[PDB]
Amino acid sequence: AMYVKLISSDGHEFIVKREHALTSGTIKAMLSGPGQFAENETNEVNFREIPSHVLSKVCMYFTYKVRYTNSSTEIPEFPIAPEIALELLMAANFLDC
Amino acid sequence: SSKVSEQLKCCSGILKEMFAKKHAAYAWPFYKPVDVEALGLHDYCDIIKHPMDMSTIKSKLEAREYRDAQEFGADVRLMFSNCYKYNPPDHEVVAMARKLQDVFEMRFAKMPDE
Amino acid sequence: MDVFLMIRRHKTTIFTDAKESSTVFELKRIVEGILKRPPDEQRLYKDDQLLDDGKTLGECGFTSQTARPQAPATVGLAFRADDTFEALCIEPFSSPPELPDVMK
Amino acid sequence: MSLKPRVVDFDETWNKLLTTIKAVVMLEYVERATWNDRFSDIYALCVAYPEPLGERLYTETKIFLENHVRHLHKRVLESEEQVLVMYHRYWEEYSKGADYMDCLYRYLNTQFIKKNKLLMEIGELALDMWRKLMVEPLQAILIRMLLREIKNDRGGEDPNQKVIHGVINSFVHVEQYPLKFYQEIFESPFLTETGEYYKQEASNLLQESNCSQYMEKVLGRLKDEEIRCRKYLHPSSYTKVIHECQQRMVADHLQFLHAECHNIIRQEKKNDMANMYVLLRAVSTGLPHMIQELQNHIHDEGLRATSNLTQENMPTLFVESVLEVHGKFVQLINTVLNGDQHFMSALDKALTSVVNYREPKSVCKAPELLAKYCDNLLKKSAKGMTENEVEDRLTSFITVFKYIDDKDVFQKFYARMLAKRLIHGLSMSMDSEEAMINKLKQACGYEFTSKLHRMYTDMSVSADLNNKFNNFIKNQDTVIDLGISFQIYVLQAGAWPLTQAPSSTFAIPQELEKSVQMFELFYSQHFSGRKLTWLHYLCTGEVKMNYLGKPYVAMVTTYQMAVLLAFNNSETVSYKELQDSTQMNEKELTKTIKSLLDVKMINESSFSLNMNFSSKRTKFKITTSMQ
Amino acid sequence: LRSVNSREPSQVIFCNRSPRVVLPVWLNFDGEPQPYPTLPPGTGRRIHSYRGHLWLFRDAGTHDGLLVNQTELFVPSLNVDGQPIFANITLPVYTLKERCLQVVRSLVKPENYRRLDIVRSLYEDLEDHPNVQKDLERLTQERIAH
Amino acid sequence: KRFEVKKWNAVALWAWDIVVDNCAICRNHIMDLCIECQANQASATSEECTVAWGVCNHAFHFHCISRWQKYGH
Ligand SMILES: Cc1ncsc1-c1ccc(CNC(=O)[C@@H]2C[C@@H](O)CN2C(=O)[C@@H](NC(=O)COCCOCCOCCNC(=O)C[C@@H]2N=C(c3ccc(Cl)cc3)c3c(sc(C)c3C)-n3c(C)nnc32)C(C)(C)C)cc1
Ligand SMILES: [Zn+2]
Ligand SMILES: [Zn+2]
Ligand SMILES: [Zn+2]
C-alpha cells in the first residue's frame, strides 16, 4: 500500500510508514512476526492505548529519523512537550525500538 | 652589506645540528611559539617577556640582524632561563631545559674563532 | 527545500516532505496519491488565507529554515464535498492534565 | 484515534488473540477488522496496570507454541503412506506461517528476552520445538525416507529434489538467534552412506575393469557424485562426501595403482597418464612412486639413446638426445598433469643423471664437449646454420647444461679455446662470440665472466696503450717506416689462459724485434694491467726474397723466420747456428728444423738453405703442430 | 579509555556544534577524564593536545554521550603536514528515548526517580542514564563488541 | 739469398709495474690494499680500486688513498 494506516482508539484515522523508519529497526522488526497478509495490503494499524498529540509528534520524529538514518545533512534535536514525559518513559521501556 | 662571520657560519651549523631529529623530540614545542593563550597563561608572557624559540634563533641568524654568535648565545640563555624560571627546580621540565642549555654550550665548545 | 507539513482535518492524518519551491498543486497531487482524492477536490489552507496550488511551500512561510523538526508544520485540510467545498474543520486534540504534586 | 490507557481482561484477550493467530498461521486470509484488532489486543494485554501481565500472556503464548508443535507432530503421524511428502508439506506450511513473519510479534521478539535476560529465542525456539514435536520423534522416518530416495535415485529413478532440499534445510535452519544444526544432523549419515557406496563400487571395479577403464569410470562416477551432492546438500559437506569417495576409491588402491603405473608410464597412454595424475594429485601419497618411476625411465631412455653416439659428432649427438628427451618429457607432463613443480625437479634430476654419467676408466669430458660444440656452432667453416639459429642453440644449450658437473673445467677450456681462435685470426665476429658470452654470462654469473672481461680488456689495453704510444710516435720527432702491417694484444693480461710458463729465453728475428723494441719504447708511460710472463708463442709472418728462383714466401712461424733472418748472415748453417739464432730449446729446434726441411723450404747434423723449394701452392705455410 | 601519553603534538581543535556548553571528557596518566572550560554551540575550542589521544563530545549541561565525532572519540594522530583537524562533536542517533530518560531525570531530580504513577522500572531501566564514567565505559563496551 | 719483404707480425712488450709511493697514515699497502683495501683475498679489484694519485707521483690504498704516475695495478 502507499501508506501505513495507523489509527489509535479515539476516533481519528492516520497513516504512517515503517520502511520510512527502517533506521528504527524497531519499526523494521516490530512489523516482524506472525503472518498478516491480504490482497489489499495497506498497513492498517488499530490500537486503543496511544495518545494523539504523542502519535503526531512521533510521526514527525519518524520522518526525521527516516530522513537522517545515514543521511549527512543538518539535523534538529528531539522536540517534546512537558505533559507526557512519564507516559513516554513507560512506553519506551515497553517498546525499546 | 655584511662580511660573513665565522661565528655566524658556526651558528648556522649549530642550527643544522639542532635540525636533527634528536633535539626536536624534546625542544620541538620550543621550535615554535609556546602559547601564552595556549593553556590560559595570561601570566606566562608576563613572567617571560622575551618571546623567542628555535625558530626565533633561526630567524635572527638568517635575517642578518645579529652581530655575532655571542648574540645567539645570549638569546639561547634568555629563552632557556625564562623557561627555567617559569618551571620549578624539582621537575622533568628543569631536567629537559638544563639538558638543552648544557648541550648547546657543550656543542658550542668546538667552534673556533674566525 | 524541506517544508514540514502535517494536516489535521476531521479525524485524518497525513505527512510528507513538502517542497518549498514546488507547487501547492504538487501537495494536492500528493494528497490525492495518499487519500484517493486528487488535488481537484482537495483544499489546503495555511491558517485561513487560501494558498492556491501555485503558492509553493514558502508561500505559507513554513520551510526547512523554520519548519519544526520535532513537530510537524501546521496544515489545514478541506476536501471537496459534492457541489461545494466543505469548510475547513479541525477540532482540538486530547486534553492535557497538570503536573504531579512534586514535579512542577 | 488517540486511545487512553485501559484495563485488560486476560481471558477475553487471550481468546481474541488466538482467534487471530489461528486465522493467520492456518494459511487463511482474515478480515481487516481482525488484522487491526490483533495488535491492539496484544498491546492491551502487555500494558496491564498497575502491575505486569507478561508472565500470564507469555505463558499463554508458550502453551500455544507447544500445542502447535504437538498438533503438527500428531497430524504428521497420520502420514503413514506419505511420510516424506507430508513432512515436506507441513514444514513448508510452518515456514510460510513464519514467512508472514513481517506482521505482529516484533514485541515478542524484543520485549521478553530484555525483560528477564541480558529463557530462549522466541521464533527460533518455536521452530526448534515444532521440530522436536514432529522432527524430534520422526527423525527415524525422515532419515529413512531420505536414504531410500537416495538409493532409488542411484538405481535409476527420479528423486524429489525440492522436498529433499527443504527437509534437509529445516533442521539446520532451526536456530538463528553456525554449523551446529546441519553439520550435526546430516553430514555424518550422508558421508557414511557415500563411503559404503564408494567402497563397494571400488571393490567391484578394481576387478571388473582394467586400469584405464577403472580410472575413466571413477572420473565419471566422481562427477556424478559431485552433481548429486550439489543437488542434495549445501557446500558445507560436499567436500566431505567427495573426499570420502576419493579416499575409498583413489586412496585405498594406491598400491595397485602404482604397480600398474610403471607400465602406464612406460606405455605413455596419454589418457591413462592424465587420469592417474589427476586421481593422485589431491592425494598425499599419490605422487612419489609414479614420479620416481617416470624419472628413472626418462633417465634410462636418455642414457641408452646417448650410448649410440658416433665418434665424429659426439657433441651434436649429445645435444640432440638431450633436447629430444627434455622436449618429449616436458610436453607430456605439462600437457597431462597441470605442470607439477615436482615434475620439473624430477626432470632436472633425470637430465643431471644423463649428463653427468661419466664412463669408468675415463674422465667425464662433458663440459669440454659442450664448449667445443658451441665453438663449432660458432665456427665459420661449418655452414648449415644462421646467426639466429646459433643464438637459439646457445639458449637451449644453457638450459641443457645447467646440470653439468665440471663448471670450472668447462669455463677454463672455453677460455683457452676462444683465446686460440682469436689468436689465429678466425674470430669472424667478436659480436657473435659476445652473444655466446651473453648466454654464458646470463647463466654463469658475474665471476663466471670476470675472466673473459679481463682478457678482453687485455686485447684492448694492448690495443689501447700501444695505439696511444704509436699515435705519440705519429706526433713524435723522428721519421718511421713499416713495410709490413702487424697487430698485437698485451693489455690487462689475466682473462684467458695460455698457462705454460717459459723455459728458454727467446731470440727471435730482428725483423719483428725492431717492432717489439719500438713498441716498448713508445708504450712504457702510464698504464698497468697484467705484468705476467711471456705469452708470445704466436710469432710469425712473411718476407719476399727476390734472390731465390722467384719471389715466394709462405707462412712461416717466428722460429723459422728468425732462423731465416739468421740466414740474413749465411745461407748455410749447422744445427748449432740455427739453435743459437733462434734461442729455442732442443725439442722446438728439432721440430722447426724437420718442418722446414720437409716443407720444401730447405734441403753431427748439418742444414742448408733451399734454392729450388716448391709446392702445389705457391702460398703454403709450415704448420704449427699444436692445432 | 586510557589516553595515550605520546607527548607528540596534535595541532587540532574540533569544531563542535554542541548546543550546550562544550566541556568534553579528557585523558589522564591512567585515564582520568575531567570536564573542561565552556565552548558553546557553534564555535570551536582551541588547545594543543598529545598525539594518540581519543576523546569525544558530550553535553556540558546534559552529561550524556554524543558519539565522539559521532564515533567513539576523535582519535590520536601525530603531527605531519602541519594541518589542523579535529574529532568534532555530534549527537548519537538522536534518540527520543534518551531524550525522554534525560527529561525525566531533569524534570525530577536524581532523588525523584522511583516515583511515577507507575511501577519502579522507568528510573533504572531507562533514566539510569548520563554519567561521565558510565558514558565512557559504555562507549568502550560498544568498542569491545568492536 | 733474398728478402725484400716487410710482412712479419712479431711482438715484444708488457712492462709490469706495481704501485709507487709511501702512503703511511693508516693507509695500507700502496701496491697491495689497506686492511679493508685488500683484505678481500677472493679479490684483485684493488687493481681497479687502485693505488695512485695522478700523473704527479701520488699513490695510496684505493678508497682512503683516493680520499687520502702509474695507471697500474
Ligand atoms: C581558557 C579556556 N577557555 C575555554 S577552554 C580554555 C582553556 C583551554 C586550555 C587550557 C589549558 N590546557 C589544558 O588544560 C589541556 C586541555 C586538554 O588537552 C587537557 N589539558 C591538560 O593540560 C591536561 N594535561 C596533559 O594531558 C599533560 O599533562 C601534564 C600536566 O600539566 C599540564 C599543565 O599543568 C597545569 C598548569 N601549568 C602549566 O601550564 C605550566 C606550563 N606547562 C607546559 C607544559 C605542560 C605539559 C607538558 Cl607534558 C609539557 C609542558 C608548557 C610550558 S610552555 C608550553 C608550550 C607548555 C606546554 N610551560 C613552561 C615553559 N613553564 N610552564 C609551562 C591535564 C588535564 C592533565 C592538566 C586552559 C583553559
Ligand atoms: Zn699503506
Ligand atoms: Zn672497496
Ligand atoms: Zn713527483
Residue numbers in the entry:
A (entry chain D): 16 to 112
B (entry chain A): 347 to 460
C (entry chain C): 1 to 104
D (entry chain E): 1 to 118, 136 to 194, 199 to 624, 635 to 658
E (entry chain B): 63 to 208
F (entry chain R): 20 to 87, 104 to 108
Manuscript excerpt for this entry:
We next reconstituted a full Brd4BD2-MZ1-(NEDD8)-CRL2VHL-UBE2R1(C93K)-Ub complex, and evidenced the mono-dispersed nature of its full assembly using mass photometry as deemed suitable for cryo-EM grid sample preparation. Given the complex preference to “lie flat” in the cryogenic sample, the reconstructed cryo-EM volume presented anisotropic artifacts; nonetheless, the map was of sufficient quality to build atomic models. We could confidently build atomic models corresponding to Brd4BD2-MZ1-CRL2VHL within the volume. (D) The ~4.0-Å-resolution cryo-EM reconstruction of Brd4BD2-MZ1-(NEDD8)-CRL2VHL. The E3 ligase NEDD8-CRL2VHL (green) recruits MZ1 (yellow), which, in turn, binds the neo-substrate Brd4BD2 (purple). We did not observe density for NEDD8 or the WHB domain of Cul2, also consistent with the highly dynamic neddylation state of the CRL2. In our cryo-EM structure, the neo-substrate Brd4BD2 is recruited to the substrate receptor VHL in the same overall orientation as observed in our previous cocrystal structure, with no notable rearrangement at the VHL-Brd4 protein-protein interface as “glued” by MZ1, consistent with the tight neo-interactions mediated by MZ1 within the ternary complex (left). Brd4BD2 displays a conserved interface proximal to the MZ1-VHL binding site, and a re-orientation distal to the MZ1-VHL binding site, toward the E3 ligase RING box domain. The “open ring”–like structure suggested that an E2-donorUb conjugate could potentially approach substrate lysines or an acceptor ubiquitin within this ~10-Å gap.
To this end, we decided to investigate the structure and mechanisms of the PROTAC MZ1, our potent and fast VHL-recruiting Bromodomain and Extra-Terminal Domain (BET) degrader, which exhibits preferential degradation of Brd4 over other BET proteins. Of note, MZ1 forms the most cooperative, stable, and long-lived ternary complex with Brd4BD2, even over its close homolog Brd3BD2, explaining its preferential Brd4 degradation selectivity. To gain a deeper understanding of degraders’ mechanism of action, we determined structures of multi-subunit catalytic complexes, composed of the full CRL2VHL, an E2 conjugating enzyme loaded with ubiquitin, and Brd4BD2 as the “neo-substrate,” all assembled together by MZ1 as a representative PROTAC degrader. By combining cryo-EM structures, cross-linking trapping strategies, and biochemical identification of ubiquitinated lysines in vitro and in cell, we determine the structure and mechanism of the entire PROTAC-induced Cullin 2 RING ligase VHL catalytic machinery, and how it operates to catalyze ubiquitination on its highly specific neo-substrate—the second bromodomain of Brd4—that is recruited to VHL by the PROTAC MZ1.
